[PDB]
């Protein structure tokens, strides 16, 4: 039974590119604050460079027929080819649109594609059309399909522009095939359980210290080390970690024991990694690979490994529960277990020892959506303001 | 049938020509400018191993682009639907505006023509119209501009006039000589002006109210239109159109600067020729609209009062018309239509008017001139 895309689901629009005779998968991305214009994020080299799907996920608000959309403008449903759909950026909360303003990227008959705050007007609405004759108008849209999107406002296709040296996204009369990948389904999401792509705090077994980086003493290189702190750090944004799965499709699925994932520090935008000297140190996105940045959750420190279980499509089954389940972090390749060094604002350093300590369990707590939004805003604004300061100093 | 055609054309962008395909395009203005040079060059225009033997490639490209623009402008929705706010009409007009920039249309209209000229022997050497730039090309431009982009800004109207229209009317007025009137270029330019350029200015008559500071350009437009009206080769329908346009613009025009055309009026009207119908109608409606400006000492507060130079001119006009009409033989429509003119002039003229002892000295000899009037 092939499952069908439905409204209120989180999806990512990905297009395949053919730069110098190789196929690399590119996902449509946007950033809420600052640049309204959309861009592309590469997902082919996930083993070498992590993909940032938090800015690529979109939600299917409403699927309406063309005449229903016209009547509404004059004033859980399965998507059908030829319907008018509304896409909201999950992070920003703003909707995709045709900006009606062009960057003049050598295409005079083109419009830039970006995010828009308001839902009124026909700029935000898009029409989905079948790729080939296998599908037809009025048919249900399958999770695995190629789609061409036509803007209602300008009758332009969501187009991948090869003309510029850098790959762009724009509304052009040429058509580009888009494939939809389901990230998560809200209705089938069990409450209180861990889902992929959640910003969360690692509460240590004492229930009063969190895994965090040093405070913002203006030393960016000093921010890289990882340790335990207790007190207000549990309320600050410097102890927020996002669990990113190694898979693009069905990333927002219930996390099972032993499933590899990457832990990203939201404030610094850096991934937790195990250096060869057994000491944890945050790496950059460019050099964050699967070899060092892969981690798993184990129910117990018992050495019988789960072997290999193939990832299953769909939302999956909920195993790890928030606030009560006890988890032990183990590096995938080295097999080391995360523990506190206990060397003596506790500032108790955390290292990985394959034997480990006895109270190495870590509970999981959800950060609020407001807290995650604010932390991402802080990271983006720090980056922009640092660039501005460097330019002014130059 | 218009929405379907527009959608098919936008789905197949190659139908718009290499200039407007978008990818590696130069624009409509650049395409027409390059077609100019193609027409100038013999090798690129012709095969080189009139029209049936030699297709003029520059004119072919020009006509293709003009036809595309004309078709799109005709595909533009009616203005009543846009006033009603119909979404499809709004969308179609927006698509057309995105397809064709306004600046390109203004530039193509600004492209000048090559006038026919007399030769040493006295023969009018006539450029081949089928070889180069023709007035119909700009006639399509105007239709697109007034059916898609719309002409509703006073500043934009003045800009368009100055850059592209007024030079064409000046060229027509210069070609209005009897020897050069018979030239086919003169006929085509007359058709272009009387069909596309001038009715547009007729429909844009209300916008002409706020032209006080741009007195020179509107005076030039008035004088060129009057000179074109004093043309031998103009057809009956063309004469009707020019009369209607001129009387429409004069009515909305500020009373002040139109004395620069009244000065030619006082010299041309007393002739009482067949050409004098439109002039005297213009006098009738202007004086009936601006009677209180002349008689009442203050006049309209915005308009002001007479400079007494206009008072003297109107005196000369009145008495010349009266004397000519008195010595003129009885013609039915002439005395039916002159009564309102003479009566309106008399009513506008203040009864207490001091006649100026200052006679004018050394008037514009172009005005006293009658063999070409220059």
From Swiss-Prot, chain B:
Question: What is this protein's tissue specificity according to the annotation?
Answer: Detected in heart muscle (at protein level). Heart muscle, brain (cerebellum and hippocampus) and placenta.
Q: How is it modified after translation?
A: Channel activity is modulated by phosphorylation. Phosphorylation is increased in failing heart, leading to calcium leaks and increased cytoplasmic Ca(2+) levels.
Entry superkingdom: Eukaryota
Q: Where in the cell is it found?
A: Sarcoplasmic reticulum membrane
Q: In the record, which positions carry Phosphoserine? A: 370
Q: What induces it?
A: By TGFB1.
Disease cited in the entry: Ventricular tachycardia, catecholaminergic polymorphic, 1, with or without atrial dysfunction and/or dilated cardiomyopathy: An arrhythmogenic disorder characterized by stress-induced, bidirectional ventricular tachycardia that may degenerate into cardiac arrest and cause sudden death. Patients present with recurrent syncope, seizures, or sudden death after physical activity or emotional stress. CPVT1 inheritance is autosomal dominant. Ventricular arrhythmias due to cardiac ryanodine receptor calcium release deficiency syndrome: An autosomal dominant arrhythmogenic disorder characterized by syncope, cardiac arrest and/or sudden unexpected death, often in association with physical exertion or acute emotional stress. Patients who survive manifest polymorphic ventricular tachycardia and ventricular fibrillation. Unlike typical catecholaminergic ventricular tachycardia, arrhythmias are not reproducible on exercise stress testing or adrenaline challenge.
Family assignment from sequence similarity:
Belongs to the ryanodine receptor (TC 1.A.3.1) family. RYR2 subfamily.
Q: How does it assemble?
A: Homotetramer. Can also form heterotetramers with RYR1 and RYR3. Interacts with FKBP1A and FKBP1B; these interactions may stabilize the channel in its closed state and prevent Ca(2+) leaks. Interacts with CALM and S100A1; these interactions regulate channel activity. Identified in a complex composed of RYR2, FKBP1B, PKA catalytic subunit, PRKAR2A, AKAP6, and the protein phosphatases PP2A and PP1. Interacts directly with FKBP1B, PKA, PP1 and PP2A. Interacts with SELENON. In cardiac muscles, identified in a complex, composed of FSD2, CMYA5 and RYR2.
Protein's job: Cytosolic calcium-activated calcium channel that mediates the release of Ca(2+) from the sarcoplasmic reticulum into the cytosol and thereby plays a key role in triggering cardiac muscle contraction. Aberrant channel activation can lead to cardiac arrhythmia. In cardiac myocytes, calcium release is triggered by increased Ca(2+) cytosolic levels due to activation of the L-type calcium channel CACNA1C. The calcium channel activity is modulated by formation of heterotetramers with RYR3. Required for cellular calcium ion homeostasis. Required for embryonic heart development.
Q: What does the UniProt entry state concerning the protein's domains?
A: The calcium release channel activity resides in the C-terminal region while the remaining part of the protein resides in the cytoplasm.
Name-wise, this protein is Ryanodine receptor 2
Species assigned in the record? Homo sapiens
Q: Which gene encodes it?
A: RYR2
Q: Please give the first and last residues shown and the length of the full protein.
A: 2316 to 2701 of 4967
């Amino acid at each position: 039974e092939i499952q069908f895309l439905r409204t209120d689901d989180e999806v990512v629009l990905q297009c395949t590119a053919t730069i110098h005779k190789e196929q690399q998968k590119l996902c449509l991305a946007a950033e809420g604050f600052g640049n309204r214009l959309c861009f592309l994020e590469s997902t082919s080299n996930s083993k070498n460079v992590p993909p940032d799907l938090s800015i690529c996920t979109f939600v299917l608000e409403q699927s309406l027929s063309v005449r229903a959309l016209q009547e509404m403008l004059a004033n859980h449903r399965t998507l059908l080819y030829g319907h008018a759909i509304l896409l909201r950026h999950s992070y920003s909360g703003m909707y995709l649109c045709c900006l009606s303003t062009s960057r003049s990227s050598t295409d005079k008959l083109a419009f830039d594609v970006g995010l828009q705050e308001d839902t009124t007007g026909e700029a935000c609405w898009w029409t989905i059309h079948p790729a080939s004759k296998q599908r037809s108008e009025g048919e249900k849209v399958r999770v695995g399909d190629d789609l061409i999107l036509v803007s209602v406002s300008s009758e332009r296709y969501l187009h991948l522009s090869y003309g510029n040296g850098s790959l762009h996204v724009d509304a052009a009369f040429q058509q580009t095939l888009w494939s939809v990948a389901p990230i998560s389904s809200g209705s089938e999401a069990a409450q209180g359980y861990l889902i992929g792509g959640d910003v969360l705090r690692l509460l240590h077994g004492h229930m009063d210290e969190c895994l965090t980086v040093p405070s913002g003493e203006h030393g960016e290189e000093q921010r890289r080390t990882v340790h335990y702190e207790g007190g207000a750090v549990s309320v600050h944004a410097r102890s927020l970690w996002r669990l990113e799965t190694l898979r693009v499709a069905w990333s927002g699925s219930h996390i099972r024991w032993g499933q590899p994932f990457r832990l990203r520090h939201v404030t610094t935008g850096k991934y937790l990694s195990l250096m060869e000297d057994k000491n944890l140190l945050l790496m950059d996105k460019e050099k964050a690979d699967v070899k060092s940045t892969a981690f798993t959750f184990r129910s117990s420190k018992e050495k019988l490994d789960v072997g290999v279980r193939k990832e299953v499509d769909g939302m999956g089954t909920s195993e790890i529960k928030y606030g009560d389940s006890v988890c032990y972090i183990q590096h995938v390749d080295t097999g080391l277990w995360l523990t506190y060094q206990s060397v003596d604002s506790i500032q108790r350093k955390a290292i990985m020892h394959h034997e480990g300590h006895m109270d190495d369990g870590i509970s999981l707590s959800r950060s609020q959506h407001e807290e995650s939004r604010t932390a991402r805003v802080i990271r983006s604004t720090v980056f922009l303001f640092n660039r501005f300061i460097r330019g002014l100093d130059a | 049938n218009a929405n379907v055609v527009v959608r098919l054309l936008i789905r197949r962008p190659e139908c718009f020509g290499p200039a407007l395909r978008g990818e590696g395009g130069n624009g409509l203005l650049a395409a027409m400018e390059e077609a100019i040079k193609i027409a100038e060059d013999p090798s690129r225009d012709g095969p080189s191993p009139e029209e049936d033997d030699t297709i003029h490639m520059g004119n072919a490209i020009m006509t293709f682009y003009s036809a595309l623009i004309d078709l799109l402008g005709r595909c533009a929705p009616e203005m009543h639907l846009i006033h009603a706010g119909k979404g499809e009409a709004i969308r179609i007009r927006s698509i057309l505006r995105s397809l064709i920039p306004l600046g390109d249309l203004v530039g193509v209209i600004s492209i000048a023509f090559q006038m026919p000229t007399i030769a040493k022997d006295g023969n009018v050497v006539e450029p081949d119209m089928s070889a180069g730039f023709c007035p119909d090309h700009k006639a399509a431009m105007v239709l697109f501009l007034d059916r898609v982009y719309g002409i509703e800004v006073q500043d934009f109207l003045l800009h368009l006039l100055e850059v592209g229209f007024l030079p064409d009317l000046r060229a027509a007025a210069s070609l209005d000589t009897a020897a050069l009137s018979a030239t086919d270029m003169a006929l085509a330019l007359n058709r272009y002006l009387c069909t596309a350029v001038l009715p547009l200015l007729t429909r844009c008559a209300p916008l002409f109210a706020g032209t006080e500071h741009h007195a020179s350009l509107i005076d030039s437009l008035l004088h060129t239109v009057y000179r074109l009206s004093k043309g031998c080769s103009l057809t009956k329908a063309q004469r009707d159109s020019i009369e209607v346009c001129l009387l429409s613009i004069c009515g909305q025009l500020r009373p002040s600067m139109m004395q620069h055309l009244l000065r030619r009026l006082v010299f041309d009207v007393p002739l009482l020729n067949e050409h004098a119908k439109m002039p005297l109608k213009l006098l009738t409606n202007h004086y009936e609209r601006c009677w209180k400006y002349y008689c009442l000492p203050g006049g309209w507060g915005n308009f002001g009062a007479a400079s007494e130079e206009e008072l003297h001119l109107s005196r000369k006009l009145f008495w010349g018309i009266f004397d000519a009409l008195s010595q003129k033989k009885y013609e039915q429509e002439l005395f039916k239509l002159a009564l309102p003119c003479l009566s309106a002039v008399a009513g506008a003229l203040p009864p207490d008017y001091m006649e100026s002892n200052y006679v004018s000295m050394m008037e514009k000899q172009s005005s006293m001139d009658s063999e070409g009037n220059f």
